[model samples]
Structures are given as C-alpha cells and as structure tokens.
Target chain A: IEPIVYLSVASREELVPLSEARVPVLDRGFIFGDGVYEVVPIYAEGARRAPFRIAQHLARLARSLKKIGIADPHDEAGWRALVARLVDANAAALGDGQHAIVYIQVTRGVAKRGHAFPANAVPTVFAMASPLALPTDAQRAQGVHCVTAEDRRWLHCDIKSVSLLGNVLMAQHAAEHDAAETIQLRDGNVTEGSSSNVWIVKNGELIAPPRSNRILEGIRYALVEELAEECGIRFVAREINEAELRAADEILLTSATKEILPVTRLDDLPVQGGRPGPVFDALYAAYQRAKAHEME
Target chain B: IEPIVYLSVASREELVPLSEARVPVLDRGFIFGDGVYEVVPIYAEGARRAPFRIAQHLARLARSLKKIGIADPHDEAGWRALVARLVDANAAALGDGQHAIVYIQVTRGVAKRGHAFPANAVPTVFAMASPLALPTDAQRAQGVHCVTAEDRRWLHCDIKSVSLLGNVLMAQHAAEHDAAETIQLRDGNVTEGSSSNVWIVKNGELIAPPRSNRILEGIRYALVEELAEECGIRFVAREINEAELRAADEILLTSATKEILPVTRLDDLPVQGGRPGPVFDALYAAYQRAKAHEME
Candidate 1:
C-alpha cells in the first residue's frame, strides 16, 4: 500500500508519511481531543481551490478554536497557503478522474499533561490529504438506510472537536445494524446524524433541526437551503420531532462526503415510497453543479 | 533532553524516546479520544506495583471499556507482565526513594476517518511511565485551595474516556485563578474535582457524592471509605449539596497521585478554619498506612 502523505507542521515543515507520522506524547489533541478538525471535499472536475467550502470550513474551525480558548495562529491567507502546499504535496497520487479530501486539524499544541491550555501553547497544525471515496451509483440510486438512536453525546456538538468517541459509538451501533448512519435524537427531538445533517421533507418542504449547540451548523446546511430556494422547494429550519421524522415524505442526509443522500429506509422500516425522492435529486444535482462552478 | 524514555507498544515492543514518541496519525486515541487511561502512582518506599491499586484501577478500566464498546485485548496476566517490564524500564532515572506514575491507555484502534467504530477493529494498547511529582510539603501542611465551577462535562464522566477537553477547560479556569483544583458541581450538587474525587468531612462523618454515571468512581472511593471506617469516622456516599460542602468542617480530594489532599479554601472563602484539620491529618496518616501494606 502506498503510504499516505501528510504534512506534519507541529514545530517544523515536512511531509511525514501517514504510517510514520507521530505527535508528542503530551499533545493535548491526542489526550484530551483539545483540537478542531475540518474536512473539505474536492472533485476531479476542476474543483478550484481544491477545498470545497474553504471559507465556511475555516470559519467553523475558527469558531471551535475560540470556544476552547485557543486562537487561530493562521490568518485566512496563511491557511490558504498551507492548504495549497498540502495539495501540491499530494499531487503525485492524483489520477485523472479522481478527487481527494483534505483534513485540516489544529490542536492547542503540546504542553505538560494537564487539563489547562498553556498560556503560550503553540497550536499543532496538521493537514493531510486522502483519495476521496465517492458514493456508489447504487447507493445514490436506491438511497441509504439509517438507524435512529438517542443522542447520548456531550452538549457541545457544535464544536468539530476530536472528542468523538460518543459519535463513534453511535455510528458503530448503526453499522452493526447494517445502516449507513445514525440519526440521533435528544429528549425525543431529532438533533442530527452521527456525522451529518438530517433533513426531512414534508408537504414538499425541507425541514431541518434548528441551528444550535445541539447540532453542528454543517456547511452543507447553507448549500441545501440555497439549493432548495433555487429549486423552488420550501426550506425551513425548525425543531424536528421523532414522529415527523418517521412519518416524513422523504429523509435526506447532507454531509461533506455523501453530499445529499436520500434515506429510503430507517432502522428496518421503509420510508414513504422507499426510494430516493425529488428533493434529494434536485439538491444533489445542484450540489454537484455548484461544486464545479462556485467553490474556487 | 535525553528524550525521556517512554515505552510505546503498538504491534510490538520498544521504548521511543519521549520527545520523539509518536503513534500513527490515525490512532483513534489521538483523533477521537476514543481511549481510556489509568495513572498508577509509585512510591519510593518499595513501590510494589507502584501503589498500583491493581485490582480497583483495572476494574474501572474494564468498566470504561465496556461503556465505550471496546474490549481489553490484554488478559490480567498479560497486563501484569507488561507493567512489570515498564517499571523496570524506567528505573534507571529513579532515586532510591523517588517515584513515578504509569499511564496505561487503550484505544478502540484506528480506521478510516469516520464517526463510527470499525468492524473487527483491533484495540491499541500504549503504556508509558513518567516520574511522579509528589505534593509539596507546604501543600500537605497548609492544605490547598480549590475553585468551584459547574460540572459542564459530558454526563458519562464515569467512563474515564480521554474525551477530556471540557475537563481541560475547567482545570485551566482554576489554574488561571491560582487554585490547586476545580471542585466541580452538577446542578448545585458537588460531583468531584477535575481529576480527583471530592470529599467533605461533616461533624464526624465523611460524605461524598453517590456513585453514578455522572461521575467517575475514583479508586480512592473504596480506599477512603475503608480508611474512614478504620479510623472510626462515619462514611457516607450521598449527594453533597454545595451549601453542605461550603459549610463542611473540612473538604478533601483523593486520587492515585495526590492520594489525599485537604481543601482549605473554596473560591475566596476559607473552609472552616482555613487550615488542614484533624480529620485530614488522621485520614492522611491512615492513607499512608494503607499504602504501606494494603495495595500490591
């Protein structure tokens, strides 16, 4: 297997083979998940900037850093330079029709093993790229199945921090049940999926859980909203209840990877009509079209 | 920097100089905090198993693994052998009467970046030993001050998973104010310290928060109870209200490292006489005696 190339920028600049990449033992990111990460997907069709939604992902990263009392050491220009460098570093592996994803991680640097963020802790800036695994044609055609579970994770779901064991457990649960995702609920109200935004269409309108701490304000959230308006579909952000979610005419999950995935079945129950719906068709196509045109 | 020797065990065994010790960039422990760690303290006075409290700590570790859907790959005997090896490996720098702490961490293993556990994922076992820093004599003589804060951490604190950014924030809060620890409260009820168990001496009884999913049942919980009984002090594990804690005769904290520490002040107010009390002295001595004979 070709060793994945990753740019390690802890206190130096160099491409560390993923297999050989290492962080200091005291790195808070490894210990406390005291870091924020963002993933941006780029397509092979001349996806400009090589990072889709670069501004939005970086904005969320900044928000997470501020939430944890850390500062963004890199300005927008600085970050752009780093991402460009990382992309160039990985170009040797790129195939003509293949795309890739870049993972940008910033941790509140290494320090003595304690809970406190050190006053002068330098943030660990690690950026890596990997070949993108796009959804299969069958998956997009037949749509996907998801399992529902209570959201037992911490309250700060808004931060894209690495403290994701709970999310991992929940996703593992769905996988064991042969599902693609775990749509979570808190106090019986739908929050979001383990790693994506959950949207339900009813009466020809797309409704999502309101943006709040209970859910990550997914960058796709804006894309879906904009696409819905452009496609003449009613879009609303409101509290989604379990009953409405279960009885919805259509269920769609939006994520960086899946883009717009229609959920044809939930748990073992078939959703209405049990097939991909028009909303997914419109939004997903618009998503791809926008990807090729808007994101430079 | 002789690169403090640290034993890094992945598929095999070798000690990586601490300064350069690194794990795979994709290690779930580093990326997801999907791991559990136990810190065992050693004492210079014939640190057998290094004041390991072997059974109790391992039991808690097992419990944490179960909660997070992870399995301990090592059998008890396997663990013991590895610990013995590590203790010997770190002895070159130890003084005749010096001590160190051993950290045993197990993560759910690495996989593609996702929000779920992988099927048939192997658990990563990493262990390292570091010289222990004992409480200063001044801290023991004069006791220590703690700042009170709301326990805004995840509800599953009992698991001891490495998702500790919230704990980090709280500890940083206390440190900024020049305090020794953060005495956390959940909904106006005392939960525990940032990294220790909180205890209060009321009249002649030692009171503590009840064992629940909201707090970690420190290894010191049972030890403290046994010490209280042997010292002729009543022991109770009930929810301690903030008022009761603030008005208690004395406040105390316990952990593997600290063993036991007196809280002479909470916020700006002095706890009782604002000095180490008779109960702390008695319990502290009893703790030493227990350490001398009871633990392996």
Candidate 2:
C-alpha cells in the first residue's frame, strides 16, 4: 500500500513530489547522521485520537535536540498549529475528524564536508501524518508475547538521533522469533523495549527502569506515572534485574503507537497470570479518557 | 573555489552526473554508520603514480566491511578503472597530472530500518577523485605545528565510516588553536592524528601506534614503513605517551593528502630542536621519487 504523504512542514505547504524530495548529499542528516525525530499517534472519532501524549513527546524531542546541539523549534502554539493542520488534512480522507499518527523529523543543516558544527546551516524539517491502527480488542484483552535481548547499542540512547542501526537489528531479531516486541537488557538490568518503554508490576507496585542515558524518557512513561499516582497504584523507577522481570506479576510496554500494552509472555514463559492485569485495565481506561478530552 | 570532480564505478562506466548519483537513504552507510572509505593520493608522472599501497588499503577496507557483516565488492578491476577515470577527468585541473587524490566509499545497502544485520541488503559503492596539494617547499624545509586532544570517539575507529563527527570536532579544536593537525590521545597514550597517522623519531627509532580498533590503518602508514625500512630508518609500532612525544627528536604526520611532513612543535612546545630533522628529509625525498615514477 502507498504510504500517506504530507509536507516537510505542513499540509497547506505544497508537497514536494516524492521523486524530488531530495535531502542534499552533504546534509548533516545524510552526512554525519546528525538529527532527531518524533512520532505522534493520531486518532479518529470514537477511535484512538492521535495518541494523547503529544506535549510530552515534543518536550522530549526538544531535550534530545538540545543535547545534540540543535536549537528547538515550535513552542506549544507551533506544535498545536502543525498537529491541527495534520488533523484537518486527514479529516476528509478518513471521512470525518478521523484519528491518525503525525511524524516530525528535524535535522541540523548542511555544512561543508566536515565534522565541525556549522555556523548557520539551515535546519531541515519534515512532518507527515498517517492513519493509526489500534490494537485488536482481543489482543489487548488477552495480551501479547515478547522476548528479551542484550542492549548492544551506543551509549547515547537518550538522544533520538536518526542513527538507529542498533534498534533496527534488535527489533528484527524479535520479528524473526515471532514475538510482538523485544525488551532490551543492559548489564543484567532491564532497559527498554526495541522502540518502546517497558515496565513490570510486582507485589502491586509498578517498576520501570529509571530515566537515564540508557533509556529514552518516553512520553507514555509520564502518563503512566500520573495515572498510577492518581489511582493510588504504587510506582517506582529503579533498576529491575532480569530475574525480577521473570518473577513479576505483570509486564507492560508503552510508546506513542502502543500506548499501554500488556506482555503476557516473555520467551516461552508466561508473564504473571498469562493475561492483562487490573493495573493495565485501569491505566488503559484512563488513557482513553485523556485522548477523548485532550483538546477540550 | 569549486571542488574538482571524480566519479564512481557506475559513474565512470555510465557517465552519470554527480547530481543524479544516489545512495539509498536507508543504506547502512546512511543508517547505522556502517562502512569503510579510503582517500588515495595520485601523483605526477611517476613510478609512484599512486603510492604502491592500493593493495594494502583495499585489504584493510575489506577487513572493515567483513567485521561489520558487509560482503566485499571484490572489484579490483572496477576500482582500478574508477581511479583511472578520476585521474583522467581532472588531469587538466591538476596541472598536467601533477597530483590528485581518489576517494572510495562503500556501505551495506537498504535493509528494513533496524540495528540487527539484514541478511540480504546489497552494499552501496561510491568513489570520486580530486586535485591534491603537497606541503609547500618552505614548510617541508621547516615543520608544521600540532596540538593534542583526548580521543572521545567510539571504539571502532578502524571502520573509516563517513560518520566522522568525533574526528571533525577534534580537528576543529586544532584549527581553533591554529595548529596544522590535532594529535589525539586515548587513555594517556597517543593514538594518531585526527585525520593523519602520526609517527615520532625517538633515539633514532621511528615509533608509530599499532593497528587497533582505535586507529584507522592508513595506507600511507604502510608506505612510510616500507620506505623507512628501505632507507635504513628504524621503525616500530608501539605505544607512545605525551611525555615521550615531547622528548622525541622529531615528529611526522602521514596520510593520503599530507604524505610525510614534520611536526616541529606540538601545543606550542618546540619538538626536539624545533627543526625538521634528517629522517624527514630522507623519507620525503623517497616519497617524491615514488610519486614521480609511479603509473599513469
């Protein structure tokens, strides 16, 4: 199927034909892999409205660009304008105010073929929206399976640069193993999923890897924390060893696309009771309300 | 000034414009920062038409690709043809075939974006040539100055991938300091120059760092070793510390562009007697002759 397309900036902006959307040969994005991007899930009426955790996502994206020496663009108003534009563009296509996912990528501008930071390279910005796919109701109720692998990627996982060979390899491994996702472990401590954040429930307490360079401070993570606190469910962010994960009562994954997903099994072993737990049920319900009332 | 042009294997055979040349956006070179490249010097009419080190350079490139799970293009004839084409294209710009430089780059091709190796991605290949410049006669008679910086790059510096942000930053530090090159130190031991292989003459013995993941196995390094042996200059590949470098009788830098040039001062401290020594004189003379007599 052909992928949906949008401007590098907005929908009203003319879309460069796919054939002519050339990033320069010396673009930092093309040259030294110097850039960061964010993906926001868009939702339609009665469907998941673009995953509801956009402000947090943009904040994280800004932090990432700041760490990598790129200036952040778009304050809250700018993000709202762009996301609103995308929402409006796909409304007719989806037959009403339909839900979809918006993707934004920003790269440090082109400099001469050198590693020095360019004095004034124009940043390249691209944004597009795509339809969102909600997890099947059965899958969400029954939960899904996952596998674990070593986190052999670079030290700077905190910055969401376009340089993602390590993540690609690990995710492919999970696909080959017929697993829904791959959780990564660094030095015996659980880090995260291939492209998602991971968490476990043990003894009625929610446990997740701490926010460190080893983890990409996921937007859903903040939402989970807030939901857990409001619901009086215990929450902690600390090192969780593999042994503990194996013994946890429940496993969950969080990301823009997969807001709150249960992992019923890891490898061939069942996670907790081999089904979605009460905590996930409550959080998922709260997440739905957040999406429904996001603009209101 | 506009840069001189050179074409790759396909470009030479098909005469494709450089503007139309494309390496896939998802190629490993563009993705994981996977691949190796080389810049080989082309000289005026000479037995050293190109330094007698193409084999050594190609061998190292092959090893780098193998380590990173990329199959060798194994195109010696293609490489030779591409190099020849580049030489012919810029012969006039280079002033009657006086000197030039050939750049070759290869990468594992488009795979589904992930970190794990794709079993079936094709390798992307690109090559180009440009006019070369030799150190001025006065500088050769005297010596260039250099500065030292800690090596903060990744572990696999041997790959020679175009992902050179670390080296670029270090080189810029040297440029800011008004030094000709930045000699890098890793864990208190001299690794090499940012873009050049470094050597020192201590007690009449020529000492250079051994080949490791921390250093790119430069083609000029092999040529220098062979020439030093022929000229009865002592050569050893071993660790040298900053303290030792300060006390050395002379210092030298070698690379495709620089060839063999002396470093009389480092970080503003005079190296030995602050003059180019006899060892540099002998090696430079041999290098000049090699370039003068090498192939067309």
Candidate 3:
C-alpha cells in the first residue's frame, strides 16, 4: 500500500490523483537534503485547524532552508492555499466533527547532480493529510516516561531536514528502553527530545534550551512562551544543564502531536510529585481553548 | 532526461524506460536515509574495473549497515553479480573501449512511518552505470588546487550513506573557490577531503589519518599502503594535524573516481616545489596496471 496521499499545487491550484504529480528525483530534498517541512494538526470537524503559531512554523522552516543554502518557497498565502486544498480533499473522510493532520514538505529542485548550489533550480512541493490520533485518556492523565542519551548527531539540529539518521538512531534508543520519548544531550547540555522540545518548570518559571543551532526552533516553543506570558508564568530560553533536568520540579515535551505532554519520569527517575505539574495543566487547558476557537 | 542508466542484478537486465522502474517512495533510502553504496569505476573494453580494494570496500559497507542497525543482504558473490550485471547492461552505450563507472545503492526496506527500528524492513537495492570522465591529461599533469574547511558533518563518516549534505556543502565551497577539492579539518585535526580520502607525504613518508568513526575507511587507503610497501615508500596511518597538512612535502587524494590525484596548492599555499611529487608518479602508474589486470 502507498503510504502517502499525494497532492500537487500548480498555478496556485490543487491537482488531484497525486500519482500523476511529478517530483524530480534530483530535487534538493532528494539529493543534498536541502529542505524544510511543517505538520499542522487537523480538527475532527472536517475543519483544518490553524497551527497554534502558523507564522512561527513557516519562519522556522524558512530559516532551516536558508541555513542549508535554499531559499524559502512560499509566503503565508501560499501555505494557506496548499494546506487548505489538502484539508478540503480529506474533509469527507475526516467527517464534520473529527480532526486530521496536514503535512507539508518543500524541497529545492533538480540541479546538476553535485553539491554546488544551482543558480536556477526550481523548488519541489509536496503535501498530504492524515487522520489524527489523539492520545489515550490514560496516557494524558498519567503523563509519559523518557530516557536520556548523547546527541551524537549533526551540528545543525536547527534545520528540520529530511536527513534524519541521527534523530532516528536516538529515537530508536528510546524505543529500546521502552520509553515514550528520548531527551538528547550534547556536551552535558540538554538539547531537546527526539521529536519534541523539552522544558523544565523550576520555581514556577518555564525553562528551555536557547534557540541555538543545536536545537530546532519548534512551533510549540512560541506557544509555550505565549501561554506562559498569558498565565503570568516565567519562561526563559537559556542553556539548561543536565543537572537542572534532574532536579527540575516538572518535565514537559512539546510537539504538534503531543501539544504539551508532561514527562513524569526520566530514565526511570520519577519527576517531583510524579504527576502533571500545575503549569502544564494551566497551559494545556488554554491550548485546547485556542484550538477550539482559532481561525485560519 | 534521465541522468543515468539503471540495471538489475539478475539477467544483466537494463531498466528500459527508466521512469517506469519501481523505486518505492518509502524505501529506507528515501525515508530514514538507511543504506550503503559504492561508486566503482568502469574501464574500457568491457572490462570490469574493480575498486582498488574490493574486500575492504565490502567490509566497510557491511560495517556501516551494522552501525545503522541493518543487516547485510548480500555477500561478495552477490556484489560481484550486481556489478557485472550493471556493467554488461551498459556495455553497448558505453562502447567496448570506453571507460564507465557503476553506482550501487542498497537500502533497508519500507516500514511504518516511525523513528523506531522496524522488525523486518526489506532493503531496497538500486544500481546504475555512468561514464567515468577522468580529469583531462593536462589537468592531471599540472595537478589541482584545493581549499580547507572544518568537517562539520555527522560522526558516522565511515559509512557511505546516500545522505551527503555536509560533504556537498564543503565540495561546493571548493568549487566556488575554483578549487578541485576541499580538505576538511575536524577540531583542528586533518580528517579527509570532501569526497575523497586525504594523504600527505612528510619527510618522504606517506602519512594518513587512522581509521576512525570521523573518516570513511577508504578502499584506496589499503591499496596505497600495499603499493607504498611494494615500491619501498614508507606509509603510516597516524593522526595528522592541520599544520602537517599545510607543511607537507606533497598532498594527495584518492577515491574510486579520483584514483590518485596530486594537490599542488592548498588554500593558496604552494605544496613543496608546487608540483606532483615523485611518489604520485609511481602510485598512479601502479593503479593503471591494477585496473588493466584481473585480481584474485
């Protein structure tokens, strides 16, 4: 079975029967792994939910492509149109009260098959939507467990490229430990989770690693900042050492899928109080409200 | 137009209408970047020009798959069959007396979309043959210049994975500078070239960096060691610093594509005497002889 439900955007219109869509094999995404992508969750009501921070996600993708020597391809309008088409096509399957997730992948087009940047390579675009699976009630209620490991990945963890062998290996490490997540460490500094941004609540303030080349700039990161500010909670994007992670009152993982998942255990060590912290409860409830009422 | 001619391992089958050949989109090569590959040169007269050290190349590929948590799907006989089939399929277009090169890519099979290791992901295999365009005789005689940069790539450089963003970037830097190659430095220590292995002659001894996770164990490294011993030229695989690279009597590069090329100038500094060293002459001549004759 084909894993992807493909779609194409041409002349600012959606093309159906995605099998007919042509993505050049020599595309930068396919070649040197020069590209960026975003995954936006879809609500159950056949309505595509706006990303909690859409602009932030696009900006992060743009920054990633720029770092790897590719220009950003779309503006806000372009992203909306592309995502809108995907959501519309799957509207029936998702039903009028259900939710889905939209995935967008943009790549630099074919050039001479070499490392040198082509002065005139077109950009390749791919998008798809899938049914969203919400976390079980038990999972959300109890929080999740995780493991820690050395990063051992590339220097530019900031760019969300398709080249993800290192991340895959680290995620596999977590799987081997039968944990829900893997928190990576670089030179004794806490980086981020395998596929999520990590946070610690210390003394009522939320602390996360600074936005550096060592960590990806997550969309949820901005949400966390906003939620913290709205709730009068302190939030700092600074270097959080490994010792801080161990001693923090609460640990949290954030991504498009989990939104804001409390990490109650680290490598079998129970977090302080062993349950979701008060800050997480406050932010998660606010996040749900934002999702219910936010417009495109 | 298709950039290459592809073939299958069985029946010396040419993949006519290359666009129709099935390369699953979800193949690990495309998905998780899980795979190993080799670029072997093709000689004239339909002769199968083996890599300088076939055993060493296979061993390295196997090691890479192991590190990436994949099983080796083929043995020496299987590799020989695959290369021979690709070479035979391209014989006519390549011309009996013309040289060509074969590229073999083996990838772990499709799995569910997750970072964790799949229980039984099949490996996707692909092979293609292309014309081997050696540097012009004039260019070879004059030798080539190169630039230097930091090796800001992943740790598993020893694996010949299709994922090559870092090397691509470094090579682009060299091309932008109008140089033939990029000599990479890892933490001030000489690692290797962008796409080839680096070696230097210091005080009449051929010196190279030891086999480590930081550098790909080049097939040509072993061949050069044997040739140096046979020709009574001293060789050592030891850790060399950037100062040694800059001050060496001669700088050299070797790969399946660039069998043996001299670097007369590095980052605007002329190597000793600014000419291809005498050792290069003996080694290049021996390389040609090895290609012309079959080895057990």
Candidate 3 on A1-296: residue-level lDDT in tens?
A: 22234533222334454344444344555445555567777665444344445666667767767877765666878877767666776666556666667767665655545567778666666676666677667777888999998877777777787676777778888989878889988889999877899999999989999888788878888778888888889888888888999899989999888888888889998899788899889888878877776753
True contacts kept of each: 0.77, 0.26, 0.43
User: Residues B1-296, candidate 2, lDDT per residue (tens digit)?
Assistant: 23344322322223344545544344556545555677777666532245346666677777767766677766766667667766665555556646666777776665544456677666766665555677888788789999998876656667676655456557768878878889988879998877888999988889999989788878777788878998899899999988888888999999878889999989998988899998898999988766655543
Candidate closer to the true structure by TM-score (higher is better), 2 or 3: 3
**In model 1, where do residues sit more than 4 Å from their true spots?**
A1-4, A46-49, B1-10, B46-49
- The predicted structure with the larger DockQ, 1 or 3, is 1
Ten contiguous residues minimizing lDDT sum, candidate 1 chain B = B1-10
Chain A TM-scores in order: 0.95, 0.90, 0.88
A231: Cα error in model 2, Å: 3.7
Per-residue C-alpha lDDT of model 3 across residues B1-296, encoded as one tens digit per residue: 34344533222334653444444344445555556677777666545444445566667777777878777777988877766766676666666566766766666666545667778766666666767888768767888999999888888787787666677778889989989999989889999887899999888899999998788878888888878987889998888898888999888999888889999999987898888988888888877777666442
lDDT of 2 by residue, A1-296 (tens): 22333333211244433333444445566556667778787766653244466777788888877877677767877876777765565554555555567767676765555555677666666565666676779889889888998876655678776655456557767878878789988889999977899999988899998888788888887888888987789999889999999998999999887889989989978887798998888888888777767844
DockQ of 1: 0.72
Chain B TM-score, one value per candidate, order as shown: 0.94, 0.87, 0.90
lDDT, residue B56, model 3: 62
Model 2 residue B197 CA deviation (Å) reads: 4.2
Question: What lDDT score is found at residue A104 in candidate 2?
Answer: 72
Report the CA-based lDDT of candidate 2 relative to the real structure.
0.72
Candidate 3 segments exceeding 4 Å error:
A1-4, A7-28, A46-51, B1-14, B46-52, B293-296
